[PDB]
Design a protein around this ligand. Structure first.
Ligand SMILES: [Mg+2]
Lengths: 53, 220
């Protein structure tokens, strides 16, 4: 009947898991930040030459 | 003025090797410096085939006999220009040798441009530098390719502006527009050092001989 008093354990688990989800979002963002930018820099350094020179 | 010019400028033009550049090198010295090593056969350029001796295990070997002849011609031209007091500009985008080439230019009293060649340095020179600027009388390419394996735009611009170009052309280079190509290895430090030393020595010899001839003429 939605009485949290006797659902305390499950509610605490849910809250802790949500906090862990936010923490995981933060850590994943910082970890994401080879990167496409660096790889494009490398490819620019060594470009494909489909023509003559 | 007439006799001075006749005996100073035109006198050396009557001799096959007035500055004696052939003594500055031998095929053995070029070999020891590894001037004969080119790129893989896949990187080869169609216009560099006449100068390639062969292919040793998919690695091109530059004919050092042709290199010796071409280097003789290029060094003689450079010596004559330095004697005539023309501006000699050394161009190279090989960052491994930028510092060395700049030092060689400073020591020999000539100029160097080893940095990012901004568009118009030669074709737009009057606007960029000033209407009375004096463009180089000779451009010496220690590496005719830029840093993306394309010909240095200075080659095309020098051809446009009618500035003769000496140039070390590897097996993957395009010697079509280089006035004096010197087929050789432009990637080995030994080869680059030999080229720098040769051009420095030739230019210094030419300048000192110019001073000596001027003194001889003016003292009489
Ligand atoms: Mg090379």
């Amino acid at each position: 009947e939605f009485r949290d008093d006797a659902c305390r354990k499950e509610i605490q688990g849910f809250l802790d898991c949500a906090a862990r989800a936010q923490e995981a979002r933060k850590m994943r963002s910082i970890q994401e930040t080879l990167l496409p930018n660096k790889l494009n820099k490398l490819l620019q350094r060594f470009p494909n030459k489909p023509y003559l020179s | 003025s007439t006799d001075f010019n006749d005996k100073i400028l035109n006198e050396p033009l009557k001799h096959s090797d007035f500055f004696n550049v052939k003594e500055l090198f031998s095929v053995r010295s070029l070999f020891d410096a590894r001037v004969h090593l080119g790129h893989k056969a896949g990187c080869r350029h169609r216009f560099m085939e006449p100068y390639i001796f062969g292919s040793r295990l998919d690695h091109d070997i530059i004919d050092l006999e042709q290199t010796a002849t071409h280097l003789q011609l290029a060094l003689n031209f450079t010596a004559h220009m330095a004697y005539r007091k023309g501006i000699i500009l050394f161009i190279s985008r090989n960052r491994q040798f930028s510092y060395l080439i700049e030092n060689m230019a400073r020591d020999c009293g000539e100029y160097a441009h080893t940095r990012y060649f901004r568009g118009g340095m030669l074709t737009n020179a009057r606007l960029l530098f000033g209407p009375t600027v004096r463009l180089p009388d000779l451009i010496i390419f220690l590496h005719t390719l830029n840093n993306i394996f394309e010909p240095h735009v200075a080659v095309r611009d020098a051809a446009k502006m009618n500035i003769p170009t000496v140039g070390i052309v590897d097996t993957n280079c395009n010697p079509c527009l280089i006035t004096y190509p010197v087929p050789g290895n432009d990637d080995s430090p030994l080869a680059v050092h030999l080229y720098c030393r040769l051009f420095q020595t030739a230019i210094t010899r030419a300048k000192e001989k110019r001073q000596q001839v001027e003194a001889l003429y003016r003292l009489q």
